[PDB]
Amino acid sequence: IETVPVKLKPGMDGPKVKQWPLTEEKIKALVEICTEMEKEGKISKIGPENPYNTPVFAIKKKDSTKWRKLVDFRELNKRTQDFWGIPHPAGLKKKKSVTVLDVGDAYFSVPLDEDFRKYTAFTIPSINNETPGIRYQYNVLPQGWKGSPAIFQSSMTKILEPFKKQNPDIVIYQYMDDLYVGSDLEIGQHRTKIEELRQHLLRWYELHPDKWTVQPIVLPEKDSWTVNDIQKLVGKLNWASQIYPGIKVRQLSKLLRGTKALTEVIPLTEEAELELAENREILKEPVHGVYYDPSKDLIAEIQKQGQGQWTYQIYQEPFKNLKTGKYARMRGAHTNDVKQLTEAVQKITTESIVIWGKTPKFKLPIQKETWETWWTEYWQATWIPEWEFVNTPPLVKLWYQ
Amino acid sequence: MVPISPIETVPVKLKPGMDGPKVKQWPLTEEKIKALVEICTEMEKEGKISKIGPENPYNTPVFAIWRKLVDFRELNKRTQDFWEVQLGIPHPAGLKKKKSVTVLDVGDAYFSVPLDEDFRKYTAFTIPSINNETPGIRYQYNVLPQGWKGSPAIFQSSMTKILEPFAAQNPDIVIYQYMDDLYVGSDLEIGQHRTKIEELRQHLLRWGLTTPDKKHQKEPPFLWMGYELHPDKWTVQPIVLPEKDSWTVNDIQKLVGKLNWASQIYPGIKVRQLSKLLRGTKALTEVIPLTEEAELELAENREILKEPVHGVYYDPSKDLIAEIQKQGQGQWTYQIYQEPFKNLKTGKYARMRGAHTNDVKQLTEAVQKITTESIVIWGKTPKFKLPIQKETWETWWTEYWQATWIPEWEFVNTPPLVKLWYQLEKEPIVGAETFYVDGAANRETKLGKAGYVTNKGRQKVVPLTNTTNQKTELQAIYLALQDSGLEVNIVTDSQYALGIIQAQPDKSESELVNQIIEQLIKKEKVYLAWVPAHKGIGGNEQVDKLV
Ligand SMILES: Cc1cc(Oc2ccc(F)cc2OCCn2ccc(=O)[nH]c2=O)c(C)c2cc(C#N)ccc12
Numbered sequence: 001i002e003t004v005p006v007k008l009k010p011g012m013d014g015p016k017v018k019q020w021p022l023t024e025e026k027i028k029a030l031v032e033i034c035t036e037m038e039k040e041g042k043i044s045k046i047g048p049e050n051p052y053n054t055p056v057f058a059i060k061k062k063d064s065t066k067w068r069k070l071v072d073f074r075e076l077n078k079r080t081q082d083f084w085g086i087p088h089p090a091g092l093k094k095k096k097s098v099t100v101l102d103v104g105d106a107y108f109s110v111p112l113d114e115d116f117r118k119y120t121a122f123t124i125p126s127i128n129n130e131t132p133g134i135r136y137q138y139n140v141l142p143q144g145w146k147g148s149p150a151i152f153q154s155s156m157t158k159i160l161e162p163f164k165k166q167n168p169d170i171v172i173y174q175y176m177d178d179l180y181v182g183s184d185l186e187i188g189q190h191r192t193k194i195e196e197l198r199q200h201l202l203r204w205y206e207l208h209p210d211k212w213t214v215q216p217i218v219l220p221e222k223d224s225w226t227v228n229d230i231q232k233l234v235g236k237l238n239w240a241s242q243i244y245p246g247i248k249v250r251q252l253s254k255l256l257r258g259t260k261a262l263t264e265v266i267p268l269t270e271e272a273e274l275e276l277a278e279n280r281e282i283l284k285e286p287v288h289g290v291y292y293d294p295s296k297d298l299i300a301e302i303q304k305q306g307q308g309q310w311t312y313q314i315y316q317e318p319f320k321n322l323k324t325g326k327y328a329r330m331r332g333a334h335t336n337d338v339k340q341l342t343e344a345v346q347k348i349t350t351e352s353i354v355i356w357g358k359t360p361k362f363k364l365p366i367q368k369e370t371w372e373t374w375w376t377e378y379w380q381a382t383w384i385p386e387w388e389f390v391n392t393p394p395l396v397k398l399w400y401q
Numbered sequence: 402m403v404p405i406s407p408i409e410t411v412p413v414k415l416k417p418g419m420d421g422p423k424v425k426q427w428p429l430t431e432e433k434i435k436a437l438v439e440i441c442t443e444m445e446k447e448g449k450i451s452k453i454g455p456e457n458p459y460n461t462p463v464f465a466i467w468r469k470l471v472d473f474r475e476l477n478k479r480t481q482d483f484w485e486v487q488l489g490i491p492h493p494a495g496l497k498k499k500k501s502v503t504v505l506d507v508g509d510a511y512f513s514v515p516l517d518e519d520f521r522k523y524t525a526f527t528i529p530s531i532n533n534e535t536p537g538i539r540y541q542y543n544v545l546p547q548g549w550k551g552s553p554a555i556f557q558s559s560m561t562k563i564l565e566p567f568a569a570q571n572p573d574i575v576i577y578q579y580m581d582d583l584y585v586g587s588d589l590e591i592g593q594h595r596t597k598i599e600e601l602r603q604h605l606l607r608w609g610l611t612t613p614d615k616k617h618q619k620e621p622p623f624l625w626m627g628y629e630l631h632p633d634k635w636t637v638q639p640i641v642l643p644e645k646d647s648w649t650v651n652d653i654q655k656l657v658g659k660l661n662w663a664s665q666i667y668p669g670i671k672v673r674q675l676s677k678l679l680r681g682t683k684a685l686t687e688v689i690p691l692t693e694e695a696e697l698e699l700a701e702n703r704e705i706l707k708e709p710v711h712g713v714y715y716d717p718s719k720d721l722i723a724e725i726q727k728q729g730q731g732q733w734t735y736q737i738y739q740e741p742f743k744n745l746k747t748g749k750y751a752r753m754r755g756a757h758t759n760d761v762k763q764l765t766e767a768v769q770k771i772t773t774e775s776i777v778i779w780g781k782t783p784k785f786k787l788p789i790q791k792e793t794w795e796t797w798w799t800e801y802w803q804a805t806w807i808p809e810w811e812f813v814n815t816p817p818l819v820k821l822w823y824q825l826e827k828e829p830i831v832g833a834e835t836f837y838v839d840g841a842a843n844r845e846t847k848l849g850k851a852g853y854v855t856n857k858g859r860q861k862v863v864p865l866t867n868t869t870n871q872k873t874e875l876q877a878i879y880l881a882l883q884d885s886g887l888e889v890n891i892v893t894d895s896q897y898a899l900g901i902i903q904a905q906p907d908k909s910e911s912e913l914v915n916q917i918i919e920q921l922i923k924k925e926k927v928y929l930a931w932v933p934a935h936k937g938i939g940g941n942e943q944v945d946k947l948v
Contacts (some may be wrong), residue, residue, distance in 0.1 A: 257939030
């Protein structure tokens with residue numbers, strides 16, 4: 001009920017960001033929503049004296065036909081001063097199950113610092129530039145802003161204090177508008193406890209981290225090898241040598257001696273089998289000297305494998321993976337690559353939030369224009385990560401397959 | 402005297418760390434001075450300005466051309482940034498047909514709107530007296546000065562705020578707001594329409610806004626922003642293409658712009674051969690000759706711009722359809738329509754700048770473009786008619802390493818059709834010869850070698866002058882393709898060559914790559930395998946091409 005003063009970083013003016021085109025249904029949804037929000041004092045109409053603008057669009061979350069308003073506060077977030085810090089709950093990723101809750105509605109109670117309100121300006125656009133866009137600014141704490149949870153930290157603490165004192169074995173973390181709750185209970189007991197916590201938040205997405213780990217490099221096991229088989233093996237090993245020190249391929253390359261047909265079967269020598277075994281032993285071990293640096297950016301690379309399968313790696317320094325995985329989940333996305341990629345990015349980002357408490361910068365295997373055109377049509381997440389586009393096909397594709 | 406409703410001012414500040422402009426007043430002729438005195442006298446009588454005391458430090462230069470002209474450039478450099486919604490303008494193809502339509506142009510747009518009183522002291526200017534034997538006559542603005550940075554935005558916002566209640570009370574009519582103009586439209590009867598227009602201009606009169614009293618000064622056809630607007634249709638204003646035996650770069654830019662402008666309704670407009678001459682620009686004076694391609698192109702443009710073509714207006718009850726055709730040389734053309742032969746609008750798409758490319762990608766980009774444009778204009782994505790088989794697109798997107806998507810579309814058969822020219826095997830071919838290829842060049846002498854050895858004993862090494870490593874690595878592959886059967890396995894150590902071929906171009910700027918493509922097209926089955934170099938991989942000989 002008392003506004004805390006919020007400023008920007010030194011030498012940084014408020015965000016001015018072009019609002020991108022919206023379809024008619026999304027525009028109408030945003031009109032309805034923002035009208036209802038205006039009647040409740042959550043936002044107010046502003047004049048031309050406000051130069052600043054932030055993009056805004058509409059989505060539909062899981063199991064809901066109701067449109068939701070989403071603001072791309074990325075630029076405002078990076079231009080907002082750093083808020084200080086709560087050490088990341090490293091035990092959250094070690095819990096059996098974690099449930100994500102939407103605590104966004106709680107932000108609209110707390111008023112936003114007046115002097116700062118002009119920086120949260122956004123515009124509902126019109127079709128064919130018929131009429132000027134509707135301009136609003138936030139009066140309360142906006143969802144998607146990084147300052148909103150930082151301001152609501154104390155409040156959230158005071159609210160969750162009884163539940164925390166009740167169940168010390170339950171880990172509670174908060175990121176943006178989402179609240180992560182981890183434990184080791186049963187799915188039924190989990191759901192009932194979640195109903196309990198939700199009702200506890202009322203009067204005031206099952207995710208199992210244990211079913212996800214890192215992944216090793218495996219080599220084929222064959223009775224008979226072809227020249228092609230051995231060539232691919234040598235390729236993959238030569239690649240993996242950039243990661244694991246003791247990999248050697250000279251005794252396998254010795255088999256390829258002479259020019260033979262790719263489908264011709266070559267029996268392995270004892271030296272070759274020995275070398276392959278040693279390489280296996282080497283690969284079974286983890287990677288040497290791999291640490292996480294909180295002062296460095298997280299990078300996520302995603303490769304399309306085909307047939308709904310996608311692989312990914314989160315790292316900081318090249319060949320030093322902090323996490324590897326393979327999203328192959330199929331829901332309604334069968335004919336649409338972009339939907340698959342969007343859901344993949346969302347899942348990976350979520351995992352990243354759970355593990356490190358921050359989002360990674362993505363490197364997407366898609367053309368900029370395609371992604372920029374379609375990614376908002378499948379985006380159910382309240383946050384947004386950063387991304388770039390790789391236009392050159394990677395050779396390592398089948399090496400993660 | 403009926404009270405006119407008060408118009409609340411918009412608070413305005415100068416940019417942070419800056420102060421109001423102080424500029425030396427220019428010397429004027431006695432005639433100019435008298436003229437300015439009379440003008441500013443009547444303006445002061447009208448309340449647009451007011452005399453100020455010596456206290457005001459700030460001053461702005463004024464000129465006479467009689468009509469006065471206050472140069473606010475410095476104040477504009479010192480005034481705060483404003484929100485401009487004027488980015489983009491309404492496109493005629495996006496308008497919905499109305500039975501009755503009215504155009505109202507408000508007189509004294511900026512002078513009808515009051516200015517923030519705390520800012521008026523920054524708009525101060527002086528009039529030089531005769532012979533300067535008396536202190537110059539001092540003035541400040543009380544309303545929005547024309548030529549000021551903040552005038553359009555504030556005027557627009559005020560107008561919107563005024564128009565909102567009338568619009569809310571009149572869902573049966575639609576009002577478009579653009580600068581100093583309002584465009585009302587309705588499907589009502591002409592009498593009811595004229596009546597509601599009278600109501601509207603009355604409602605504007607309540608706030609002190611003047612509209613044309615007579616029969617509205619503009620009636621169809623409307624000439625607006627390069628467009629011609631007719632009751633049942635729209636088109637562009639007639640095209641003007643200069644003809645001269647000597648062309649400059651600026652003339653090329655103007656011609657290109659004009660053709661681009663004409664291309665939104667005239668289908669088949671091409672501009673590549675004329676845009677290629679815009680390499681090495683920034684020099685506006687030059688003489689650039691035209692090729693036969695460019696001349697035949699411009700003649701084709703004069704052929705298309707021979708007879709007028711009209712677009713229609715938008716009907717929300719009917720589907721939105723975009724059809725695309727390939728024009729060649731990276732050029733694409735499209736038509737957006739709802740009823741056959743009756744276009745809403747047309748357009749073109751030129752491929753981006755790249756070393757390699759294929760038709761499917763370009764088509765995809767075109768689709769994205771048309772999609773975004775459509776969403777801007779009609780607020781929806783159209784259904785597509787594409788010159789590509791469903792099975793082709795299937796194979797492409799399923800085997801493409803990148804993620805890709807096209808919205809709802811159907812195959813129209815209007816050649817040339819976009820096709821996949823070659824497809825590599827996912828597995829080594831049984832019974833097919835195996836060509837281990839390699840190429841290597843000397844960095845200094847630019848001398849290289851490229852060739853292959855095969856499992857059947859077939860060998861070749863070719864010596865090359867003026868070449869690089871990458872060129873020899875490509876050349877070796879090309880040699881393997883030339884001297885092999887309809888089916889072939891190829892082994893290379895070139896991540897470069899494999900990188901190029903795995904992008905599946907059907908066309909390239911490198912002749913060698915194009916020849917490799919032409920070779921692939923002739924093949925039945927091609928398996929391209931990769932191996933690491935210098936690993937002592939048998940059959941892969943760096944030592945053969947390094948001699
Ligand atoms: C951008 C626009 C809309 C408009 O009119 C419309 C205004 C509001 C609407 F809802 C729908 C309109 O038009 C639908 C299409 N149309 C058009 C012209 C006509 O004669 N009849 C007709 O049906 C009019 C006159 C305009 C006049 C000028 C000028 N000068 C510049 C822009 C105009």
